[PDB]
Amino acid sequence: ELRVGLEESELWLRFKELTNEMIVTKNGRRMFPVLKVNVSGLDPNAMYSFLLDFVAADNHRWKYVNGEWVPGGKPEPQAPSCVYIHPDSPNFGAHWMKAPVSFSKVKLTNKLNGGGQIMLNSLHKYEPRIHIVRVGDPQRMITSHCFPETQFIAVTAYQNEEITALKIKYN
Ligand SMILES: CCN1CCC(Nc2ccccc2F)CC1
């Protein structure tokens, strides 16, 4: 049976209970925490690519008011559906299962300025989503896992001083 497990879930949860925030910039910013998963039940012999995208969680934006995140207006038009290809792609099931799959290099941006960055809209809540794509499959079979522990709001600057502090503490 295919299982994809979130690594460092108790670290994600510490951020999620404050409401998690990820910085977006012109040139793109790496995430902290880093999204990492453990995989079992792939065909060790088969070849697969790992994809990461970010799903919009709400039909509204958010605002940090009196130390509380609250609904903050109508959404911006959906961000362009950007997909990040894990740099080990394509590779054997055995490769993906022998050690946690780490998306350490992905960069979140608020400007389309290339370099395989992911464009997100400031003050919008997103949920990371990993896809496993079997290579050479005439059926183009894909599997999708969502990680609700990893939800965050995209921000141009941290709003919660406690998130600023957690980021420095654990990073
Ligand atoms: C005290 C509770 N806390 C335990 C440690 C933390 N884990 C963690 C910290 C830094 C790097 C990697 C990690 F997994 C998750 C929650």
PDB file of N, CA, C and O in Angstrom, residues 76-82 119-121 126:
ATOM      1  N   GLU A  76      -7.720  37.602  -4.308  1.00  0.00           N
ATOM      2  CA  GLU A  76      -7.161  37.936  -5.633  1.00  0.00           C
ATOM      3  C   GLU A  76      -7.480  36.777  -6.578  1.00  0.00           C
ATOM      4  O   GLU A  76      -7.782  35.665  -6.137  1.00  0.00           O
ATOM      5  N   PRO A  77      -7.494  37.023  -7.907  1.00  0.00           N
ATOM      6  CA  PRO A  77      -7.581  35.942  -8.889  1.00  0.00           C
ATOM      7  C   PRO A  77      -6.558  34.846  -8.552  1.00  0.00           C
ATOM      8  O   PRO A  77      -5.475  35.207  -8.104  1.00  0.00           O
ATOM      9  N   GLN A  78      -6.915  33.573  -8.746  1.00  0.00           N
ATOM     10  CA  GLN A  78      -6.024  32.408  -8.468  1.00  0.00           C
ATOM     11  C   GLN A  78      -4.640  32.678  -9.074  1.00  0.00           C
ATOM     12  O   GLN A  78      -4.587  33.062 -10.256  1.00  0.00           O
ATOM     13  N   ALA A  79      -3.573  32.501  -8.273  1.00  0.00           N
ATOM     14  CA  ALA A  79      -2.144  32.457  -8.690  1.00  0.00           C
ATOM     15  C   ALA A  79      -1.958  31.451  -9.830  1.00  0.00           C
ATOM     16  O   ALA A  79      -2.643  30.426  -9.865  1.00  0.00           O
ATOM     17  N   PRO A  80      -1.042  31.682 -10.807  1.00  0.00           N
ATOM     18  CA  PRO A  80      -0.819  30.707 -11.880  1.00  0.00           C
ATOM     19  C   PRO A  80      -0.424  29.349 -11.280  1.00  0.00           C
ATOM     20  O   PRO A  80       0.432  29.329 -10.396  1.00  0.00           O
ATOM     21  N   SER A  81      -1.082  28.269 -11.718  1.00  0.00           N
ATOM     22  CA  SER A  81      -0.893  26.892 -11.184  1.00  0.00           C
ATOM     23  C   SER A  81       0.555  26.449 -11.431  1.00  0.00           C
ATOM     24  O   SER A  81       0.811  25.773 -12.450  1.00  0.00           O
ATOM     25  N   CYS A  82       1.465  26.869 -10.551  1.00  0.00           N
ATOM     26  CA  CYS A  82       2.916  26.584 -10.645  1.00  0.00           C
ATOM     27  C   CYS A  82       3.162  25.195 -10.054  1.00  0.00           C
ATOM     28  O   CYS A  82       2.597  24.904  -8.980  1.00  0.00           O
ATOM     29  N   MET A 119       4.795  31.056  -7.458  1.00  0.00           N
ATOM     30  CA  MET A 119       4.059  32.328  -7.293  1.00  0.00           C
ATOM     31  C   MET A 119       2.874  32.103  -6.342  1.00  0.00           C
ATOM     32  O   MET A 119       2.011  31.256  -6.650  1.00  0.00           O
ATOM     33  N   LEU A 120       2.839  32.816  -5.210  1.00  0.00           N
ATOM     34  CA  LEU A 120       1.697  32.779  -4.269  1.00  0.00           C
ATOM     35  C   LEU A 120       1.202  34.214  -4.067  1.00  0.00           C
ATOM     36  O   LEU A 120       1.976  35.135  -4.263  1.00  0.00           O
ATOM     37  N   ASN A 121      -0.054  34.394  -3.680  1.00  0.00           N
ATOM     38  CA  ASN A 121      -0.606  35.739  -3.409  1.00  0.00           C
ATOM     39  C   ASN A 121      -0.475  36.012  -1.915  1.00  0.00           C
ATOM     40  O   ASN A 121      -0.939  35.182  -1.117  1.00  0.00           O
ATOM     41  N   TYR A 126      -2.516  28.718   1.929  1.00  0.00           N
ATOM     42  CA  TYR A 126      -2.126  27.651   0.972  1.00  0.00           C
ATOM     43  C   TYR A 126      -1.828  26.359   1.713  1.00  0.00           C
ATOM     44  O   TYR A 126      -1.371  26.413   2.866  1.00  0.00           O
TER      45      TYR A 126
END
